[PDB]
Amino acid sequence: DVNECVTNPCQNDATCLDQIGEFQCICMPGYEGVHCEVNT
């Protein structure tokens, strides 16, 4: 499994979680999207 979090995929000070052949960005409140790029 590649840890995708090593390359900092999460924007806007989101937290990156490395999963089983995927990653997830946990956004700060106010942001959404795969990379936490959409500022609600």
Next chain:
Amino acid sequence: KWKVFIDQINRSLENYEPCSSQNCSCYHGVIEEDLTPFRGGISRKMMAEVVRRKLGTHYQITKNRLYRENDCMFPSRCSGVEHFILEVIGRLPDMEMVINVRDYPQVPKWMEPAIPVFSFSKTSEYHDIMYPAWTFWEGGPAVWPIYPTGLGRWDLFREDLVRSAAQWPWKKKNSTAYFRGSRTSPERDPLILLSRKNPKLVDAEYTKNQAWKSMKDTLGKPAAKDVHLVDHCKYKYLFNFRGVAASFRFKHLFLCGSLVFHVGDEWLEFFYPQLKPWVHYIPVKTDLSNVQELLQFVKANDDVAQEIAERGSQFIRNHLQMDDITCYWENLLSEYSKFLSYNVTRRKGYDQIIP
């Protein structure tokens, strides 16, 4: 006492074939090399296998329109790639391709037959076809707080680095070598340890990346604060290392007007074959075993060191402009399309990429 290095520099410069082109033709040899394994033609079955194996994101072009499968693990990287394809699609013939936007290449050379996958970085041990990375537009590492939405916009960053270089002419630059980055490869460790042993010689410290879990990820010390690339230009000697694959740091360091110390010679991006050791940068052995001799050498031969730094800066300034990125994309995909031995049919369910 410097004869070995001085002679190496004279030899490398005598060997150097300068590029005089105003377009991206200086990188054509990279395209030719990367497409050589496919000279027998790419069949429909071969393409179907690459797609089934999910080695990258499947794109299709028909009638100057771009189509793509739904899934992209890194939407921002697909957007950066799409930015350039859409710029040139009005001049591209019908084709399809698989564009890997993960960091690491996908087609090791021991695989037979070769199958075509586009990746941003490889070594000579891979058959991936290099393309200009997404980050030239968007989608590079989001280093908080300096690049909150991801390292990108090479066009704008070029300008900022040139202004910063002007503030730090060579003679005003600090002679302690400098590095700020995270532990994306253990090949970086000996420099950080050398820095801790001899901080006047080297100022090299580990920052943290988004996978940081413990002090092991910074070699047992608190993480260093991240430092903008424009704030690198005050240092004469800037180190560059591989990470997961090649690093986006590399191209930026030249525009500081500083002398780049490039560690290793395996991991490439498409423009690297045109940057030549001793012509444009100081090559450092992968294991760093000659780094202290090289630092003494450049300090004792500062006129030569400056000549090398200026050549590297000029090369990036003149031959890695935004127009060179777009030109390479166009020429790469045009040349690649000639090797498809069949007529592409748009896949059911692939949405069009606009605008």
